[PDB]
Amino acid sequence: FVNKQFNYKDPVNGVDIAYIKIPNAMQPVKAFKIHNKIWVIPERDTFTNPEEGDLNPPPEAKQVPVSYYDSTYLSTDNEKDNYLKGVTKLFERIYSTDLGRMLLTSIVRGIPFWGGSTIDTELKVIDTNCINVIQPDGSYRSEELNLVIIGPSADIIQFECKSFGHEVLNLTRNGYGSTQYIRFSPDFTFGFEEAGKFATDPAVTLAHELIHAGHRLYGIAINPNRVFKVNTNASGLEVSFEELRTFGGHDAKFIDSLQENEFRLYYYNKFKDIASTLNKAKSIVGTTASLQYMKNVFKEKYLLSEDTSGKFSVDKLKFDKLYKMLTEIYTEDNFVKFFKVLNRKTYLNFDKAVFKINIVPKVNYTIYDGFNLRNTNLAANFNGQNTEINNMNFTKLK
């Protein structure tokens, strides 16, 4: 999946290795283009939210296994090299499964809608769905992208999708989508039971964020104000439908069917508004792509049907298929099945431990087996994920 075996120290070339700036709306940071539309920035995220530049534990911080702070993590070239190789490895592990091959393909196709214009006959890119790539002469060129993998902010283990918003549009819920920045680290993982003896395979963790990214890129994320009040056992706790859907499996039990019907109809109409916008367009801003090219890009993204006179429309069956793919097929639970790893069987459990790991060495973790290395003592019984048995690979954090 990933074009090249990048080393962090590889010389910049202004194409797939480059110093870049992120919308807001900072010094340039070294970034690597690991695939069409997908970049990796091996830096702590002090950028997507300028205020969050302090990496020290704040007053009243939580503790492991809820949060973990270390202002020094991912500061050196060696750890940045390891981060890049770690993330690369997880993409290949994900891509090596039919399911992950499909998700990644959906992500690459998921170009954020060009809804930047104020004139409704003009297609224009939204600037916050781009990065600025520095050139040899110190100038910058704007490049559109779908996905960025970036190191975590202050709380090292707070992985999540974030994206830049629009003054008025809800890009992640209006079918338009937006460039997704996934705060993530391959250098840590979490323990669960069944004490936290067993370690989550970091590939499932990344896939979980990629699923969120899929929703957000297709502008179909469920408003976080839609929640389920948790009543599985034991007062107060809520979980968003967006998270329940992302996990899938057992947790589909808690999604209000009547509500899901509302969402499905809502987004169908949103895709319809997109078709209409493409149909009204008479001009396009930019020197690179043609109006007809971009139209085609979004035809493919939303699986629109195109008639004799170039007019677009949404196909009910094709929408149903895509929407189902994005929301029902692409789930953490389904990934567990494809990876054949031990994992939580519900989203609704709290981690019991956090571990430092290193999946870069072939002897530790592989594309095909993760920690459960075939032809080793770690092959059977998820021994590889067993933090006591696979002692060399996990260091529990304080």
């Binding site: 296994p65 979490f190 969120h212 706790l237 709290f350 981690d351």
Partner: peptide, 7 residues
Amino acid sequence: XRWTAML
């Protein structure tokens, strides 16, 4: 995001 993050 994982559930534990809500804490």
